Design a protein around this nucleic acid. Structure first.
Lengths: 122, 5, 115, 119, 56, 229
RNA sequence: CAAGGAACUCUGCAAAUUAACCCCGUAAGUUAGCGAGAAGGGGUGCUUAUGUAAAAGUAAGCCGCAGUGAAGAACGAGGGG
RNA sequence: AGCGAAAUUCCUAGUCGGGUAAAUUCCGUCCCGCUUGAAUGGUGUAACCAUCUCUUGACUGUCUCGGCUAUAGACUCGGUG
RNA sequence: ACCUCGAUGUCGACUCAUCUCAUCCUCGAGCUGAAGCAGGUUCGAAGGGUUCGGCUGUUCGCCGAUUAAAGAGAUACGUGAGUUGGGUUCAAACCGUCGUGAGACAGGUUGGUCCCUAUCUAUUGUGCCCGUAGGAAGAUUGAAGAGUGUUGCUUCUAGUACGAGAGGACCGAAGCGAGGACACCUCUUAUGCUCCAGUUGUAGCGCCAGCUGCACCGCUGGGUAGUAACGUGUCUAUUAGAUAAACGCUGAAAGCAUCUAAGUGUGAAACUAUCUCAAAGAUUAAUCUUCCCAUUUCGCAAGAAAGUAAGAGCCGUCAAAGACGAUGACGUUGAUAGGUUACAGGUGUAAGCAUAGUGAUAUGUUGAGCUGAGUAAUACUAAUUGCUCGAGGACU
């Protein structure tokens, strides 16, 4: 689903377009990051202008997973791509605008800005 | 195999 | 002893709704879900098109797909589910009960309506 | 290992059932193994219970299994099936074929069985 | 791999101690003076009542 | 503990909704009434227990010893007999239903014989890892792994006792505890319990009071269908 | 064979795409011969009309998620010894 | 002369820079070249290599991580052995 | 230089581990250069866990990011009759050096075969026979055992105790996680070769149409039942008894003092049970219940020729089982298999016909036809009007 050494697109525009996973938080040998799982990431392909360059390491929250997950309620959410947003260290993201939908499960993790600047939450 | 050295 | 396996359907008749119409594989439908951030309930509107329809009871579930800002979104809906409103808007013609080719088609990805 | 014989596949068994049902429809008594008689019994009963409709739709659908025999070719055996086999068995629901067990064979001592019809 | 020490007659006999053939059940046909098997038909062609196979 | 037990047959599992917008998986058990056959008292057999019976069958085909025992004890001629340890407070010749042993949503545990699998491999049985598949594998590439405990008689030359090894799987009575009960049907005589239950459909199912949290309840309400035609 | 896509591992070893025909477009470098099928793309089914001997080509219409629908056809680039 | 940690280099994982999130490998320069070196040839070289090595796009059960199906064996039975 | 050359197969990696504690973490305590968080040190403790990658063949090492940590060692520096060959190292060749030469180099490079069908033992399963002073059927208890025992994050307690400001709790409670395990196919997927639909080439059923065979199940899109995880449920506790380290009261010896001599205690993932599984082959062969037996009776007086009537077995159709065997349900007083009917699911408008169209084709008849396992009814087919073993309860 989402695991080590995974390249994915960037839902917001801090300067980066393609981002690779480097490790997944939680206990040892997590090997699977779900929606809302903080992940250490690196930038691979990025536009020149912005506040980031190619080489830095940041922390990100996944907002889109192609496989999806069976929610506690019973409904299932799916995607056709993989999107992530970047944060500095706090729940507040660095991004100025978030493109595309964001999962509702993130409400259970904080990050109120993600809900606040979403085009429409699924 | 062989050649135990 | 002796049974008929209709007890599966017998313990079932306590949770069905009889207002769901018929819609097979390629129709444009809308669904609303009740979200509870607080005792104030919010009515999420979810338009889309039928992708699959399969089940043997409460397991009867369908798939709704929408597109927004170039990104497509999939969802599974249980036909028999409280706080779920199901309506039919447009009917089309498809030759497959489940359509899988839609996952890689956007742009003139539409079904001619039924005649 | 490697290239050794394909052996029994879906094709081979479907032939075996088709050819055995054709033969039993031609004559009415077949010597085979018990577990092959069990395999061909389902197709035999399905075909002979579908035979009793006497219309072109089922006449077409039955062609998927029948095949010619040493004494009659495909067409005459087809006509015979609805001429005197189908119109004879209509008041009794299914179960028209029976299997009886013989002694072990001489060569491989395998289980031999008679498959036959019953009035 | 191979055996290290020769297996005497004792080992082979204790190994074949359970290999003997068991008798197969037999029954007498009603109109056939033969000692045929159980649930089977002998060389004269009767399972009893219904006939089925040639005389020989 | 004052455990309460009852018997049934797993007939199939289906899901039913509840409040708070939660989806629950539920198994359905046909609860034929059990009939007490004996009370193992602490004074006579030195252990408290209760022996019951179920699956009544026609008396003629039933064996002679069981028929005589049931005739002398004045019980329903049944097919299965079994007892539960540490169950007291029931007289001989009594009726048992799951609607006077349990509450609406109290915790229980369920036991049944595990479904068989045939002679399985080591990796599938003890969740081992398949070895390499490329760069050369040898004639085995799916097997137990090293069973070595050492080479030489100083520490080894015997295979350790009870080491995880290939063999029979399943067909052994396993148990999963801490399951919430959801649905009672005295009109159709069925019990609907959350989670999943080991054992194939058509076997024996034993529902007992959970040894972890006896007499612990939690309210669960069946969801209602509002949108009507 | 889900998602990830070399994280495997002594190293992409093995395994996967690309194939046939037709139509577009092709570098750095060079001994000016090549490199080169470079790279990177588009069409291929059916019917009718036109078009030649047939094809090819064009247009109109039709169906299927898919049309050398099956079967046989080169993974590529950059740098070095 | 030329070339130069090169298949040559002991200290060596020499220094620095490029490449990577992170580099005893790879590329470019620096040269107390322990022992480079001129027909036992030195340097550069277009095309080619079932040659070796490094990076990379697609690519995939190599892998995170195991599962199913079909056979032919292996397993029971009959004959030989 | 003691055992091996009439061969004892040598690193590392992979899988699988097991053991010791001189503890890497979680746990308890003392001291402090312990204000509180975060520490340092020492004692007690082996139940569990103790990461993923780049470089190099590598252990080691360096580096990067995590976490509770990325422990020290051993087991022929664990394990090639379980895998690999990356190397020392076999024959080829090269660069540098030594050698006047064949050639050599702890100088380095490119290429280079890993044999073996399991006897005993040991082990995981699964059986036949026999045994427990009658047999059979069940249900039991438990002698000795096996497995499970890992923890994080956020919030309240509370910015309270502490400190001054920065900073910041012990003690408990609640909610959600990772890893491992037991299961289970309702949802999601994977598979699903006698399922469905579409589809190219080709040879046939004489041609149209419709089918059949073949081309990896011919290919493609779905998909019954079953089996599976990436899927969902739970397990990871609580407490009792005796304890280590330590902590005490009372108390003298030794009028004081002192946790000890008597006594009475507190005290941890350790220890016995509390959880799960099996178990009377536990020969020391255990307990209870129901059912069965009665034909005089002789020879070398032994209870002997009649050996159930309780039941079991032979054989048969099967799977909730399954390599074989067993186990489990049923054997004409039957629902076990097969067929038929009905129904569920899947598939998606069978074929023919009618109409529109010059033709690919389109609409109605039609949500129709089809279907291995799916659910149940139904004696139509299959399980015969069969055969064998099998009782007189030894003495006190």
């Amino acid at each position: 689903m989402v695991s080590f050494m995974t390249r994915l697109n960037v839902a917001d525009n801090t300067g980066a377009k393609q981002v690779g996973i480097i490790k997944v938080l939680g206990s040892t040998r997590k090997r699977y990051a779900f929606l809302g799982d903080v992940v250490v990431v690196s930038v691979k392909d990025a536009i020149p202008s912005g506040m980031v360059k190619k080489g830095q390491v940041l922390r990100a929250v996944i907002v889109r997973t192609k496989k999806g997950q069976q929610r506690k309620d019973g409904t299932h959410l799916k995607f056709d791509d993989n999107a992530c947003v970047l944060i500095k260290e706090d729940k507040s993201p660095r991004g100025t605008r978030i493109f595309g939908p964001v999962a509702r499960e993130l409400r259970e993790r904080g990050y109120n800005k993600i809900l606040s600047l979403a085009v429409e939450v699924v | 195999a062989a050649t135990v050295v | 002893k002796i049974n008929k396996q209709a007890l599966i359907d017998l313990v079932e008749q306590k949770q069905l709704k009889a207002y769901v119409p018929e819609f097979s594989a390629g129709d444009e439908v809308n669904v609303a879900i009740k979200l509870k951030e607080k005792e104030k309930v919010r009515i999420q509107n979810f338009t889309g098109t039928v992708l699959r329809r399969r089940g043997k009871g409460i397991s009867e579930t369908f798939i709704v797909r929408k597109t927004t800002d170039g990104i497509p979104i999939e969802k599974n809906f249980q036909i028999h589910n409280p706080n779920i409103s199901i309506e039919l808007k447009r009917r089309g013609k498809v030759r497959r009960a489940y359509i899988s080719y839609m996952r890689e088609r956007s742009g003139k990805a539409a079904k001619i309506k039924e005649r | 290992s490697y290239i050794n014989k394909p052996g029994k596949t879906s094709a081979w068994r479907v032939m075996t059932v088709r050819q055995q049902v054709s033969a039993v429809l031609a004559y009415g008594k077949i010597e085979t193994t018990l577990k092959k008689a069990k395999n061909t019994q389902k197709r035999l009963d399905k075909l002979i219970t579908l035979a009793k409709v006497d219309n072109f739709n089922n006449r077409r659908q039955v062609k998927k299994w029948l095949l010619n025999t040493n004494l009659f070719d495909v067409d005459q055996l087809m006509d015979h099936l609805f001429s005197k086999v189908a119109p004879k068995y209509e008041k009794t629901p299914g179960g028209y074929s029976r299997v009886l067990k013989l002694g072990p064979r001489r060569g491989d001592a395998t289980e031999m069985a008679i498959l036959q019809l019953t009035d | 791999a191979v055996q290290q020490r020769r297996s005497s007659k004792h080992r082979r006999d204790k190994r074949r101690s359970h290999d003997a053939l068991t008798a197969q059940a037999l029954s007498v046909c009603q109109k056939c003076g033969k000692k045929k098997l159980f649930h089977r038909v002998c060389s004269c062609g009767m399972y009893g009542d219904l006939r089925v196979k040639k005389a020989y | 503990m004052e455990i309460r037990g009852i018997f049934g047959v797993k007939v199939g599992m289906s899901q039913v909704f509840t409040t708070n917008n939660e989806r629950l998986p539920i198994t359905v058990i046909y609860c034929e009434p059990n009939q007490v056959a004996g009370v193992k008292t602490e004074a006579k057999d030195k252990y408290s227990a209760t022996l019951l019976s179920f699956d009544t069958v026609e008396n003629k085909k039933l064996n002679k010893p069981q028929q005589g025992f049931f005739e002398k004890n004045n019980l329903k001629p049944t097919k299965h007999l079994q007892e539960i340890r540490n169950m007291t407070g029931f007289e001989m010749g009594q009726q048992i239903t799951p609607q006077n042993l349990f509450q609406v949503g109290e915790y229980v545990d369920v036991s049944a014989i595990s479904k068989g699998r045939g002679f399985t491999g080591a990796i599938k049985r003890w969740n081992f890892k398949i070895g390499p598949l490329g760069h050369g594998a040898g004639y085995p590439h799916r097997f137990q792994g090293s069973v070595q405990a050492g080479r030489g008689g100083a520490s080894a030359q015997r295979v350790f006792k009870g080491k995880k090894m290939s063999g029979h799987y399943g067909h052994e009575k396993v148990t999963v505890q801490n399951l919430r009960i959801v649905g009672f049907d005295e009109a159709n005589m069925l019990v609907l319990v959350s989670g999943a239950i080991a054992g194939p459909e058509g076997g024996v199912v034993l529902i007992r009071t959970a040894k972890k949290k006896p007499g612990v309840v939690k309210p669960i309400e069946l969801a209602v269908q509002t949108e009507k035609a």
